[PDB]
Amino acid sequence: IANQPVVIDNGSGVIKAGFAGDQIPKYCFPNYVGRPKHVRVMAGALEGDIFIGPKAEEHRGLLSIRYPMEHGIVKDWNDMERIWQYVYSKDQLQTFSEEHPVLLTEAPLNPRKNRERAAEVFFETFNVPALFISMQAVLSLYATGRTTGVVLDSGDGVTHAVPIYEGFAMPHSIMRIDIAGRDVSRFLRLYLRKEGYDFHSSSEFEIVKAIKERACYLSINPQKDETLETEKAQYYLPDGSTIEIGPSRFRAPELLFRPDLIGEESEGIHEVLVFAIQKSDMDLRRTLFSNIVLSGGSTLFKGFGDRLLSEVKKLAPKDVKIRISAPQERLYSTWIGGSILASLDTFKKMWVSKKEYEEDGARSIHRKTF
Amino acid sequence: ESYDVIANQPVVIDNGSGVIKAGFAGDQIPKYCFPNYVGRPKHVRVMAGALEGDIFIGPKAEEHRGLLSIRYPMEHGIVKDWNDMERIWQYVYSKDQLQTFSEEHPVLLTEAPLNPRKNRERAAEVFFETFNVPALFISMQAVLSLYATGRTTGVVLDSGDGVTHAVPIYEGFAMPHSIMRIDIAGRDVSRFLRLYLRKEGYDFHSSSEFEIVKAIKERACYLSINPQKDETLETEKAQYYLPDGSTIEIGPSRFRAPELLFRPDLIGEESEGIHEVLVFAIQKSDMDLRRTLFSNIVLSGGSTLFKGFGDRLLSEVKKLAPKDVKIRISAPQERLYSTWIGGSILASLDTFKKMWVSKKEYEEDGARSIHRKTF
Amino acid sequence: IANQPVVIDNGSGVIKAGFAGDQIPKYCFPNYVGRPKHVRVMAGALEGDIFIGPKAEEHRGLLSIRYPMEHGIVKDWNDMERIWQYVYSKDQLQTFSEEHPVLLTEAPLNPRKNRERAAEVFFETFNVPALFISMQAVLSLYATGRTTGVVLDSGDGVTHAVPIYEGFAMPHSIMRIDIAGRDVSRFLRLYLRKEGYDFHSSSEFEIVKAIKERACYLSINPQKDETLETEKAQYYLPDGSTIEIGPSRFRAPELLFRPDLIGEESEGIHEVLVFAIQKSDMDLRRTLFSNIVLSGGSTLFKGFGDRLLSEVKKLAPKDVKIRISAPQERLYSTWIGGSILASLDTFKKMWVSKKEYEEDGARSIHRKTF
Numbered sequence A, C: 001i002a003n004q005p006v007v008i009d010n011g012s013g014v015i016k017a018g019f020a021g022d023q024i025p026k027y028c029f030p031n032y033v034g035r036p037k038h039v040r041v042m043a044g045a046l047e048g049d050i051f052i053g054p055k056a057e058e059h060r061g062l063l064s065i066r067y068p069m070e071h072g073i074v075k076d077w078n079d080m081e082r083i084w085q086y087v088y089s090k091d092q093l094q095t096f097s098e099e100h101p102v103l104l105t106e107a108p109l110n111p112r113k114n115r116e117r118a119a120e121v122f123f124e125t126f127n128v129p130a131l132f133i134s135m136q137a138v139l140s141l142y143a144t145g146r147t148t149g150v151v152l153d154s155g156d157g158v159t160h161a162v163p164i165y166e167g168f169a170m171p172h173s174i175m176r177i178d179i180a181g182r183d184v185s186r187f188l189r190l191y192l193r194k195e196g197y198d199f200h201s202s203s204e205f206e207i208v209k210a211i212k213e214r215a216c217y218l219s220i221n222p223q224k225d226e227t228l229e230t231e232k233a234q235y236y237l238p239d240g241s242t243i244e245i246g247p248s249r250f251r252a253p254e255l256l257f258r259p260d261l262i263g264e265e266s267e268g269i270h271e272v273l274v275f276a277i278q279k280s281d282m283d284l285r286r287t288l289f290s291n292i293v294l295s296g297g298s299t300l301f302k303g304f305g306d307r308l309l310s311e312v313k314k315l316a317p318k319d320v321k322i323r324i325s326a327p328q329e330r331l332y333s334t335w336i337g338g339s340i341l342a343s344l345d346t347f348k349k350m351w352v353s354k355k356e357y358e359e360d361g362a363r364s365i366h367r368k369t370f
Numbered sequence B: 001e002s003y004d005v006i007a008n009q010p011v012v013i014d015n016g017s018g019v020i021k022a023g024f025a026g027d028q029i030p031k032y033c034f035p036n037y038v039g040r041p042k043h044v045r046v047m048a049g050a051l052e053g054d055i056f057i058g059p060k061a062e063e064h065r066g067l068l069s070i071r072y073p074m075e076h077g078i079v080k081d082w083n084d085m086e087r088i089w090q091y092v093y094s095k096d097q098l099q100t101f102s103e104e105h106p107v108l109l110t111e112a113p114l115n116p117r118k119n120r121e122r123a124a125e126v127f128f129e130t131f132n133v134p135a136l137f138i139s140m141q142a143v144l145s146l147y148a149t150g151r152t153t154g155v156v157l158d159s160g161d162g163v164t165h166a167v168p169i170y171e172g173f174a175m176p177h178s179i180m181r182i183d184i185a186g187r188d189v190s191r192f193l194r195l196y197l198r199k200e201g202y203d204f205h206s207s208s209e210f211e212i213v214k215a216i217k218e219r220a221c222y223l224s225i226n227p228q229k230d231e232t233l234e235t236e237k238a239q240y241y242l243p244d245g246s247t248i249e250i251g252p253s254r255f256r257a258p259e260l261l262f263r264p265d266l267i268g269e270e271s272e273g274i275h276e277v278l279v280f281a282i283q284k285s286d287m288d289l290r291r292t293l294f295s296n297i298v299l300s301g302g303s304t305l306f307k308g309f310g311d312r313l314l315s316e317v318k319k320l321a322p323k324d325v326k327i328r329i330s331a332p333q334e335r336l337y338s339t340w341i342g343g344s345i346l347a348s349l350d351t352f353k354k355m356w357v358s359k360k361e362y363e364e365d366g367a368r369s370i371h372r373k374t375f
């Protein structure tokens, strides 16, 4: 089809969408479904019992929030279908699913059934002409004008270190851990509870997420700032009241470098990156250490780069150059890479026909992917 | 199925503890308003050709007020004398009011929030058994206030005669667990004014003299921004003219009586003030709504019409609210009639057909069908 | 070296105090301060503006009642100081506070400032030789005599499921909600208002609490009992009047298992227990299900054990034995645990000494408690 293709990066926290070839996704909205929990009494209340997109943010306190994706794995598929039709709704990207091919972006090392059901949903419920599923990290490396390097993509659900060499991501050297920005927000909720601020409500979890985004940082030395009493910085809640955050500012994101602070049997993010680099043959290791690209929202923490540099230097072999690159467009880098990939005419040969899916099934979509 | 008795113009009744406002849906104002009490002849009937009957309701009870002992069927929004309430509802349908038959028109009834369930059950029983109405909807008062004002979001602070309550509503969604209610209202302020006038040398122990205390409360009373500076000072005693032509000097009782609304502890009742009712109703809701609820406050009921009520309510709310939040208190021009105007607007809609409880639905289910399809 | 340590289980509802080694807390009294609200006119009236303990219960109609604690958190610290002074008065414990080490108890996941201020009060005002802020659930399990299990402590202010493994409370599996006996009594007051019987006064809230303790039960099937015709058991008020309760008798303690009845989007008590069990290690889940220990006052509702067992069986996996233990001393289980702990010689190595607090401050309690 000669019509423009649409890139959809369905992250756990935020879902980016846009017609390919644009330098930026203009239709990014949070990835949750809000349903009203109070009883409607008037004639003329808000019509509809499903609230997705900026409307869910406008009427946030009126709604109970439910996240369809957890750790990059779609738990509720009906809500995912609702969100993906909302992507085509008149509010954002007013178009038809039949007119545009879709470049879906998916987390690496996901279960087989997830890709199978995503293809089934996009081919049956949506009469899409052409679907192609890709990864999030290889695109993020495409965005920054490189073909060799390691991408540390840290999103809302999952964080993974992916070494790519000459475009093709090494499937054997992929490292993945499930602690991400959502787990940091939960840890911040627990710590805020330990300061005398209860946010048990589902809509107040978004306020906790906002507090995480706006007032948090990673200390250079963990024990140094842990022992030192930090100044109490005050944050303004939506109602207008104020909360003193205090040590929870720096204790919360420390989960990323110490998963045992919530009893998760997994490696830290610095350990994940260094293990991803060291899982490859040594001739490429010295190049991978130099070409480190941060990606995803959770890498935007104040002081993330310095602490990651310190930890990687502590772990990596001595006398090896290490350079962390932090692009300003970290949130939208994966979508930018998807747009770049879709702009290439070779993408015309990379998608799967409706006839191809009907004939072969999941075999076609999985042999087409890497 | 089409030209049924259901399709008739419904009758809207807003029965308040102090005043009952009845009319027909579609009218701009309640055409038939009268006090919600029953008068009985106190004296001895000696002349043929006297005032016929022994139950006086409506303007007859008002013009011949001195001739009667007054009994209020409902106190604090709860019906206490059900025979008198039934009599008042029959009078609403009489030749003096609406000139109609109760069996022809559907009914919209208003009720204060958080009332006893038995009150609603008995109201439905009376309006389906004694009055054989086709259908009955029992509405909240705040929803009607928002209907009348044309809005859909707001914290309705309704201070009637027997009940004061704050109901928060957001985008047509009502939060039942943020609704607050106190039983201090205009009746309590009038009783407290009677107590103060006793403390100033005027005894109004007669039941028909309680309405004179009501009139004094309506005319010669106000609210002070600073209660302590008026407490320590002695003001100039205003002069009130009684119905018989004699005069009284009210003085410090003018402002200390309506102060009961913001301080129930003046009568030893340890309940929230009206400002605390409103602010707690806002602050019990979800946080993301609260700011909008602070910018949409709607007043209703006659007890909000005290000279200086808006200013003092704004001052107290601003004292309790978090700093730098836009507080915008609104009020309709006809505060007494707002709830009925909303009831008329709601009963005018075609959606109202799907809201009331049909008579047959009442017969099959009984009290259960009233508890649902209400609020 | 000091006298025998004094155990003080300060709940939100009732404080229970005694000396370590006693079989039961000999000095239990409600945790509120009563102040007279009427006008003293004649000489010979009651002396003192502060009434605490049985003097507050004898003259309950004369006093406005104030609760210092709310959801396990001290809201009024002057009243808390008054109450802890009364614990040491000639009516309770008959001793000076400068001679006995203290074993205070605190609910899990409390604010840090609460523990800090409690230690400051106990070391400055009362000049205790030593202090040890413990946690209620682990003490309750010690009182039962077991070392591994789950303690579902449901008190007046806060309910919480804490799993303990070999005496150590797993901190990343603690579940807590603030819906407890006081919330149930407030809900009962609301329902009695909906039944025509209206109570406003803080002294009449104690009558509502008595109605809860006397005539309230948990139905095994809420929907079955909901639809049936009620019995309307009659309760005799202190003044001699009677009230017919009816449906409010069983819907009031329903709040423990369904917080959404008051608009809270928080887990139920059964959900608290099951989520605490399922948040723990996969190896421990079988032995945690086989070892559940009830505690606190709110677990004494008629039919509480059967209802909780039914809910847990509904939520628990199949082929897993469930054994909810409901010891007779549920009210004093945590105090008995504090007494058992304080009797040991190892307790000497546990407390924060007075000199340690003098030289360190809040950090001494912060390291020693955890």
Ligand SMILES: Nc1ncnc2c1ncn2[C@@H]1O[C@H](COP(=O)(O)OP(=O)(O)O)[C@@H](O)[C@H]1O
Pocket: A010, A011, A012, A013, A014, A015, A154, A155, A156, A157, A158, A181, A182, A209, A212, A213, A214, A295, A296, A297, A298, A300, A301, A302, A330, A331
């Ligand atoms: N400045 C910031 N500091 C810390 N966290 C941030 C910041 N900006 C965004 N985030 C977090 O990043 C997450 C979104 O990252 P994103 O790359 O969109 O994840 P995904 O790829 O799963 O959509 C959000 O959960 C948000 O909490």
Ligand SMILES: Nc1ncnc2c1ncn2[C@@H]1O[C@H](COP(=O)(O)OP(=O)(O)O)[C@@H](O)[C@H]1O
Pocket: B015, B016, B017, B018, B019, B020, B159, B160, B161, B162, B163, B186, B187, B190, B214, B217, B218, B219, B300, B301, B302, B303, B304, B305, B306, B307, B335, B336
């Ligand atoms: N101008 C006024 N100033 C003070 N109080 C007033 C005024 N007008 C009416 N009221 C009081 O308001 C009450 C009537 O309020 P209303 O809105 O009828 O409440 P309800 O609907 O519960 O009857 C009366 O008891 C009266 O004392």
Ligand SMILES: Nc1ncnc2c1ncn2[C@@H]1O[C@H](COP(=O)(O)OP(=O)(O)O)[C@@H](O)[C@H]1O
Pocket: C010, C011, C012, C013, C014, C015, C154, C155, C156, C157, C158, C181, C182, C185, C209, C212, C213, C214, C295, C296, C297, C298, C299, C300, C301, C302, C330, C331
């Ligand atoms: N027999 C009973 N039935 C129901 N509730 C009870 C009973 N006995 C006590 N309670 C409730 O338990 C609460 C006290 O529990 P307790 O274990 O003392 O709490 P805390 O841990 O705060 O001391 C009181 O609020 C009371 O309402």
Ligand SMILES: [Mg+2]
Pocket: A011, A136, A153, A155, A296, A334
């Ligand atoms: Mg991503």
Ligand SMILES: [Mg+2]
Pocket: B014, B015, B016, B141, B160, B301, B339
């Ligand atoms: Mg009214």
Ligand SMILES: [Mg+2]
Pocket: C009, C010, C011, C136, C155, C296, C334
């Ligand atoms: Mg306890």
